[PDB]
Structure formats: C-alpha cells, structure tokens
Enzyme design. Structure first.
Site, PDB file in Angstrom:
ATOM      1  N   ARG A 151     -47.255  62.777  29.474  1.00 35.22           N
ATOM      2  CA  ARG A 151     -47.959  64.013  29.579  1.00 35.22           C
ATOM      3  C   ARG A 151     -47.214  64.974  28.642  1.00 35.22           C
ATOM      4  O   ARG A 151     -46.097  65.392  28.955  1.00 35.22           O
ATOM      5  CB  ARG A 151     -48.109  64.547  31.007  1.00 35.22           C
ATOM      6  CG  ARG A 151     -49.158  65.640  31.128  1.00 35.22           C
ATOM      7  CD  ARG A 151     -48.921  66.866  30.283  1.00 35.22           C
ATOM      8  NE  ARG A 151     -47.893  67.694  30.839  1.00 35.22           N
ATOM      9  CZ  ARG A 151     -47.879  69.030  30.912  1.00 35.22           C
ATOM     10  NH1 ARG A 151     -48.867  69.764  30.503  1.00 35.22           N
ATOM     11  NH2 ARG A 151     -46.834  69.640  31.457  1.00 35.22           N
TER      12      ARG A 151
ATOM     13  N   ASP B 298     -46.540  68.374  26.663  1.00 33.65           N
ATOM     14  CA  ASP B 298     -46.661  69.763  26.933  1.00 33.65           C
ATOM     15  C   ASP B 298     -46.971  70.642  25.665  1.00 33.65           C
ATOM     16  O   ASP B 298     -46.467  70.390  24.566  1.00 33.65           O
ATOM     17  CB  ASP B 298     -45.329  70.180  27.653  1.00 33.65           C
ATOM     18  CG  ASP B 298     -45.230  71.696  27.784  1.00 33.65           C
ATOM     19  OD1 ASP B 298     -45.882  72.368  28.669  1.00 33.65           O
ATOM     20  OD2 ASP B 298     -44.500  72.208  26.885  1.00 33.65           O
TER      21      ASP B 298
ATOM     22  N   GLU C  59     -51.591  68.946  27.148  1.00 35.93           N
ATOM     23  CA  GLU C  59     -52.029  70.186  27.756  1.00 35.93           C
ATOM     24  C   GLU C  59     -52.483  71.075  26.630  1.00 35.93           C
ATOM     25  O   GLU C  59     -51.813  71.238  25.639  1.00 35.93           O
ATOM     26  CB  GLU C  59     -50.917  70.830  28.560  1.00 35.93           C
ATOM     27  CG  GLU C  59     -51.201  72.327  28.857  1.00 35.93           C
ATOM     28  CD  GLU C  59     -50.833  72.786  30.272  1.00 35.93           C
ATOM     29  OE1 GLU C  59     -49.826  72.373  30.892  1.00 35.93           O
ATOM     30  OE2 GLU C  59     -51.639  73.594  30.807  1.00 35.93           O
TER      31      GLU C  59
ATOM     32  N   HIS D 248     -50.003  73.395  37.932  1.00 33.50           N
ATOM     33  CA  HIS D 248     -48.912  74.393  37.815  1.00 33.50           C
ATOM     34  C   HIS D 248     -49.256  75.642  37.026  1.00 33.50           C
ATOM     35  O   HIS D 248     -48.434  76.551  37.047  1.00 33.50           O
ATOM     36  CB  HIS D 248     -47.603  73.800  37.219  1.00 33.50           C
ATOM     37  CG  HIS D 248     -47.905  73.179  35.897  1.00 33.50           C
ATOM     38  ND1 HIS D 248     -48.697  72.055  35.803  1.00 33.50           N
ATOM     39  CD2 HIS D 248     -47.612  73.597  34.652  1.00 33.50           C
ATOM     40  CE1 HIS D 248     -48.869  71.808  34.527  1.00 33.50           C
ATOM     41  NE2 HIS D 248     -48.219  72.714  33.810  1.00 33.50           N
ATOM     42  N   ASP D 249     -50.415  75.718  36.354  1.00 27.64           N
ATOM     43  CA  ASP D 249     -50.694  76.902  35.559  1.00 27.64           C
ATOM     44  C   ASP D 249     -51.781  77.747  36.082  1.00 27.64           C
ATOM     45  O   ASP D 249     -52.343  78.491  35.319  1.00 27.64           O
ATOM     46  CB  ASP D 249     -51.081  76.515  34.124  1.00 27.64           C
ATOM     47  CG  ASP D 249     -49.838  76.141  33.383  1.00 27.64           C
ATOM     48  OD1 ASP D 249     -48.699  76.656  33.647  1.00 27.64           O
ATOM     49  OD2 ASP D 249     -50.063  75.196  32.575  1.00 27.64           O
TER      50      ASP D 249
END
Ligand SMILES: OC[C@H]1O[C@H](O[C@H]2[C@H](O)[C@@H](O)[C@@H](O)O[C@@H]2CO)[C@H](O)[C@@H](O)[C@@H]1O
Ligand SMILES: OC[C@H]1O[C@H](O[C@H]2[C@H](O)[C@@H](O)[C@@H](O)O[C@@H]2CO)[C@H](O)[C@@H](O)[C@@H]1O
Ligand SMILES: OC[C@H]1O[C@H](O[C@H]2[C@H](O)[C@@H](O)[C@@H](O)O[C@@H]2CO)[C@H](O)[C@@H](O)[C@@H]1O
Ligand SMILES: [Ca+2]
Ligand SMILES: [Ca+2]
EC number: 2.4.1.19
Length: 686
Positions: free
Chosen positions: A227, A229, A257, A327-328
């Site tokens: 994943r 970032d 992301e 988380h965002d």
C-alpha cells in the site's frame, strides 16, 4: 493452488482486507512500549504511542477475532524505523505512532517489534490464511526545517544505521529544496514538500537505488502486498520504474493512495491507475457511498452512475480497493446515527466489485472526527455486534462466489432510495437489494434477473431485514416488499464449463516473469495461453488448474497485449486486455527539452523508439510534460520509465486535442543507464 489460496500474492479480489493502525489495535508486548512523554497507555492522547504492536496482532489472529469475521488480509502501518523525536506542534506533542515518519527503510520500528516479531507475524497470518499488506511511504522521510537543523531529526535518512543525509546542508541533493506545496497543481504537489515533510528526490540515484533495495528486503520478508502512500506526490514515471522493480523481482499486489474529494473525478487519477503498474484506493467509490448512505447528499441514481462510470474509467476496476472510511476521513458512523447506515454500506461494499477494505473498529461502530479522532483504540473485541455478523456472512462470499469477486455489475431495479444489482461471472450470480430509506418500505415489482427459477433465501438470513425471493421462468422475480433500511443478498453458484478469465497479475512486467491468471473453467489439463497472437504452451506454463494458471511471459516485443487462454480442448476464453510487456528492466530518466514555446491549450509531449515511449504513436506519447517547478517554460521536463541500458531514439511533440506537431530534424538519441537515474537535456528542433 486455486485463485482463492492465501498464496495468491497477485489477486486480492477474493479477499477482505482489514486495515489496522498498529499502535491502536492491541499491545501484545508491553516491553516494547515507548516510555516517558511519547507514551500514553490509556491512549487518551491520540497523538502519542499507545503501545499496539505486532504481537498484539498475532494474538488477535490466534484468538479467532479476525478469522471469525471472515477477514483474509490485514493491512498494517509502515513497519520501517521511524524518527524518535517528540514534535511539538504549537503546544501539542506528537509522536511517529502512525509510522509515516521514516528514518531508515531497512529497519523496523521497535515500538511495533523486531524483525523476528515481523517474521512471526507473517507466519501466524499465513497459518490462518491471512495475507499481509504493508504501508510503504517513499515520498519523504520526516518533518524537517532547513535552517533549524535541531528541529526533529532534520529529516535524516539512514541506510540500515548508516547516515545517508539530512535536510540541512543537503549537498548530495537527496531531498527537494523547492518549498512547500499549496496543492495548487499536480506538478506543484510532486516537487515541493508536503507540509514540512522532507521530500525525497527520486531523481537522485542514491535515493532511487536505495528505495528499490529497501522494498526487496520486505519482499523477501514475505509480504503479500504493498500500500503506497501519497502516490499523487511522487513522479509518475518514477513510480512506474518502481513498480517494474517489484514486478520484475517478486510481484505483489500494490495499491496507492490518491485522494479524491466529493464529486471529484480526475482523469489523471484514471490514467495513473491504468498505466502505472499499480491500482488505487477507490476514493470515488468511498465518497459516493458516503453521500448516498451517510450524508444523504446524493441518491441511488448517483451511486449507479459511479458504478457504471468507474467500470468504464478503470481498465481494471476489480483492482480498485473500496472502503467507507479510513485513517483520512471521519468515521462513517456518527454517534447519534442509525447504525443501519453503516451496516448497509458495509453490505454494499462487501458485495461490490473491487478489493474491499475495512477500517479497524468499523465492526465496533467506532465514531470519531478527523485525525487523530478517527484513530482511537479499538474498544472491544466483541463478535456480537450486527456489523461483525454482517461481515461474517458476506466476506466468505468473495471466496465462494466468483460473481462477487470478478463479475460485472448490473443495475436491475432502481429508484431514489432503492438499488438492486446483479453480479455475474460464468455460472455464478449474486443479487443484492438495498433500501436506504430507513422509514419507508418499497414495492418491488418488475425485477428481472439471471437467477434460475426457484426460491432464494436471503444470504444475510434476514439480519438487515432481507426477505426471500421467488424467481419464475425467464428470471423474473415476483413482487415483494423490501423493508425500510432493508438489505438482501440472493445468489446462485455452479460449475463453469468454459474457460473464463477473471483476473491477471501483475499487469506489467518484462519477459520471463511469471504471471497469474485467475478465473474458472480452465480445466485440469494444460491448454494454451495467448499473448496477443503469440502462443505459449508446455513448459513455460508452470502451472495449470481449473481456477488458476501460472505462465512466464514470452520474449515478445515491449507493448500492450491481450491475453486469452484455451483449454486442452481448444476452447478459448474471454480476452483480458491492457497487459503491458516491458521492454526490459527499467530506469527512471528525466527528459528536458528547451525552448519549446507553445500556444494556449497546446502541450509538449514525448515519444520515441520503445514501447515505454509509445513507439512513435502520438496518441501514446508521454505527457503533457511539466514546466513550472524544476524547469520553467518554455523549458519542459518529465520523469520517465525506460528500458535500462537501451539506446533510444526520441522526439518531442506539441499536441492540442489530437492535432500534433512534430519536432523537426532528426531523432534525438540516448542510451539509458544500466541502473540509477539520468537526465537528458536537449533543445527543441524546429
Ligand atoms: O422490467 C425490467 C426493468 O426493471 C427495472 O425497472 C424498474 C425501475 O427501476 C423501477 O423504478 C420501477 O420503475 O420498476 C421498473 C420495473 O417495472 C430496471 O431498472 C429496468 O432497466 C428494466 O427494464
Ligand atoms: O503549466 C503548463 C501549461 O503550459 C502550456 O501553456 C503555456 C502557453 O502555451 C504559453 O503561451 C505560455 O503563455 O505559458 C503557458 C504555460 O504557463 C499549455 O498551453 C497549458 O495548457 C499548460 O497548462
Ligand atoms: O511513424 C514513425 C516515424 O515517426 C517519426 O517520424 C516523424 C518525423 O520525425 C516528423 O518530422 C514528421 O515528418 O512525422 C513523422 C511521422 O511519420 C520518427 O521521427 C521516425 O523515426 C519514425 O520512423
Ligand atoms: Ca507494545
Ligand atoms: Ca514528492
């Protein structure tokens, strides 16, 4: 092994991902807890370390919590070593508990655990059929101040304990010294720092090589996926060259992301997903799901449109990772809200195309605003909640009903509040009804489906007020009333007689790499695999089963191909497109053209002799190039992934719409480095 096996590092479509903030899940080993001011064992201060670690995770795996839910993959915090400073942000004390503040990508964050802890983690997971994903954040190191070197750790970067360099006195040019981005443009957010984080310079070979090496360790560690970032903040071309490094070595499912706000639909985003080598977090899906089910700022017609659009925009829609929060964002559940909404969105997600991701604590109805409020400690490991049970019933369908994992999506019934959709793959069907209206039931008549005649029981067993369904001949359902806040899943499975490809991975690689082909109906006897018109049989096909085939890419020319398979009887399968065959190993090269003045709405592009540069096809030229930050117009630049050590002929072009203007003269030429990066600078020829 079958497509669904834990060993499948190339396809997650049949999995259900559980996203975990390491620090906030479970403190299995108190001994590794930070001390002093960095620590808060009550976890009241959400900006400190709470003590969550790998051991805790391992414990939760072993005590049935995750497996019980039907979860088959976990996605954890960046495991590399973080800075140890406590940062005071205007009164408030902040620790690297999140794992986004790298110092050394070749070491572990000791708060999380040791290499040995990590290894056991991989073991226990694997033992329980759970795949492991990590966050990898190669855009930057940590918060730095160029004239206040004493601030934090000056964004220092180490290579396994060896100091490569710092933000201050960056003579090696490891970092960018361009300022802070205002997110105003894409170019702007790529070459400037993100807030105060030390922006790594991927054009510096040391940096380049260092990250390519760092990821190999972790790969060697047995990870199942990556994943990435802030992919929207690094160079596209670099990222692709990074992807090639992973794929050409040990391929794993990677997703980045790339934040999208509400109602945002970016063509840059689609292109990246389609050409980069990785897929993305489905922000478009998330945003829309929230508008419809949570905020009520859009209706079914809106969801439907997202579903049809995204199927068109993404070359591999099944590779996008869907979610309702992370988380965002604020936690989907609002304190005072009807839990049914969260239940419905989960159901929806679990039965929709893509790779579903579940933000830890969702199944516990955790509420919480933005960072760090959405990062609290999981309050309980109860399997008694309704959300827990919903996941429990649905998750497994991704493994047992390929319609869910790979099937197309089709609207069968719709109104403002109701949405009925069909999933189809081979002899498999799934029918999902959703009634967002928490106060009004709906009269459903005219529903036509692909299900065989018979009666169907709600797969949720009426948990969210679903009902049974009756299918007459012609697959038409008889009238029924869909309860307010109602949700039902109906399905039909059966052996697929013809070879049907459901997935392929990786999607980009050099010849000789093995790829994985997932689906159904391949039969047990080796057949043939086509790459374009090129036939592959026998030995190069390293494995063949009904649901999965493993084959090495033939040594064909770099380009885009269509894959197809034939069974031992010669029956062909559906085509799977957009597979990229790399020209060889890649390197990241910065192209710069001087004095390429343009008119308004006209942009410079790059093309050339290799497939990586579009083979002379203007429609496939790289660009538009950049002209603000690192080089100023009429000077244009661009970071590109190219075959390593190859002699390449290239040219620049000016495009406006589909109208092209070629550079005059003869081709420019150059030879790509064997490794590391390079910078080619030339003048536009009239
Ligand atoms: O009859 C087939 C028909 O079914 C669905 O149409 C629904 C429509 O969505 C509802 O709002 C309501 O009008 O009932 C109709 C069925 O009579 C499908 O959406 C439609 O495409 C299809 O033709
Ligand atoms: O920022 C990139 C920008 O570059 C191109 O526009 C040039 C324009 O052609 C020139 O006449 C001049 O005025 O500067 C512009 C760049 O700031 C593209 O035309 C434009 O679409 C693109 O965004
Ligand atoms: O079509 C392949 C061909 O593309 C390029 O040729 C350009 C040429 O450079 C232009 O000045 C203009 O005349 O258009 C041609 C497109 O046919 C490459 O230069 C050339 O090597 C390549 O074969
Ligand atoms: Ca601990
Ligand atoms: Ca950057």
């Amino acid at each position: 092994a079958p497509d669904t096996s834990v060993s499948n590092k190339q396809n997650f479509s049949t999995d259900v991902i559980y996203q975990i903030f390491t620090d906030r899940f479970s403190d299995g080993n108190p001994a590794n807890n930070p001390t002093g001011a960095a620590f808060d064992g009550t976890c009241t201060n959400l900006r400190l370390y709470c003590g969550g670690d790998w051991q805790g995770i391992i414990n939760k795996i072993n005590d049935g919590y995750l497996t019980g839910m039907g979860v088959t993959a976990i996605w954890i915090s960046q495991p590399v070593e973080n800075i140890y400073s406590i940062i005071n942000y205007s009164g408030v004390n902040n620790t690297a508990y999140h794992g986004y503040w790298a110092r050394d990508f070749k070491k572990t964050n000791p708060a999380y655990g040791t290499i040995a802890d990590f290894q056991n983690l991989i073991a226990a997971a694997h033992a329980k059929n759970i795949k492991v994903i990590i966050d990898f954040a190669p855009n930057h190191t940590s918060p730095a101040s160029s004239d206040q070197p004493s601030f934090a750790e000056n964004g220092r970067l180490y290579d396994n304990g060896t100091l490569l360099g710092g933000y201050t006195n960056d003579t090696q040019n490891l970092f960018h010294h361009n300022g802070g981005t205002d997110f105003s443009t894409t170019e702007n957010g790529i070459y400037k720092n993100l807030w105060d984080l030390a922006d790594l310079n991927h054009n510096n070979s040391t940096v380049d090589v260092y990250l390519k090496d760092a990821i190999k360790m972790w790969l060697d560690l047995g990870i199942d996926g990556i994943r990435m970032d802030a992919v929207k903040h690094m160079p596209f071309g670099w990222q692709k060259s990074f992807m090639a490094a992973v794929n050409n070595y040990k391929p794993v499912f990677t997703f980045g992301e790339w934040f999208l706000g509400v109602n945002e639909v970016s063509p840059e985003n689609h292109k990246f997903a389609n050409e980069s080598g990785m897929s993305l977090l489905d922000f478009r899906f998330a945003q829309k799901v929230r508008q419809v089910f949570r905020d009520n700022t859009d209706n079914m017609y809106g969801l439907k449109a997202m579903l049809e659009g995204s199927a068109a925009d993404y070359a591999q829609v099944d590779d996008q990772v869907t979610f309702i929060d992370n988380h965002d964002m604020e936690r989907f559940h609002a304190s005072n809200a009807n839990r049914r909404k969260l239940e419905q969105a989960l159901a929806f997600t679990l039965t929709s195309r893509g790779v579903p991701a579940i933000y830890y604590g969702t199944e516990q109805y955790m509420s919480g605003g933005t960072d760090p409020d959405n990062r609290a400690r999981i309050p309980s490991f109860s399997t008694s909640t309704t959300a827990y049970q919903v996941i429990q019933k649905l998750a497994p369908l991704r493994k047992c009903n390929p319609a869910i994992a790979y099937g197309s999506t089709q609207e069968r019934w719709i109104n403002n509040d109701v949405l009925i959709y069909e999933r189809k793959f081979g002899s498999n069907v799934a029918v999902v009804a959703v009634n967002r209206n928490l106060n009004a039931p709906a009269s459903i008549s005219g529903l036509v489906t692909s299900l065989p005649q018979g009666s169907y029981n709600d797969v949720l067993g009426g948990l969210l007020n679903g009902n049974t369904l009756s299918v007459g001949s012609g697959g038409a359902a008889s009238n029924f009333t869909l309860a307010a806040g109602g949700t039902a899943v109906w399905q039909y499975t059966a052996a697929t007689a013809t070879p049907t490809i459901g997935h392929v991975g990786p999607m980009m690689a050099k010849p000789g790499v093995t790829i994985t082909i997932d689906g159904r109906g391949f039969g047990s006897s080796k057949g043939t695999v086509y790459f374009g018109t090129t036939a592959v049989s026998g030995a190069d096909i390293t494995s063949w089963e009904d649901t999965q085939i493993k084959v090495k890419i033939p040594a064909v020319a770099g380009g885009n191909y269509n894959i197809k398979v034939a069974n031992a009887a010669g029956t062909a399968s559906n085509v799977y497109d957009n597979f990229e065959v790399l020209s060889g190993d890649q390197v990241s090269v910065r192209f710069v053209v001087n004095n390429a003045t343009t008119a308004l709405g006209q942009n410079v592009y790059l093309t050339g002799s290799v497939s990586e540069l579009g083979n002379w096809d203007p429609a496939k030229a790289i660009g538009p190039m950049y002209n603000q930050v690192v080089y100023q117009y009429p000077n244009w630049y661009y970071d590109v992934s190219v075959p390593a050590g190859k002699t390449i002929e290239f040219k620049f072009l000016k495009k406006q719409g589909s109208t092209v203007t070629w550079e005059g003269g003869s081709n420019h030429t150059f030879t790509a480095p064997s490794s590391g990066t390079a910078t080619i600078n030339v003048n536009w020829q009239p």
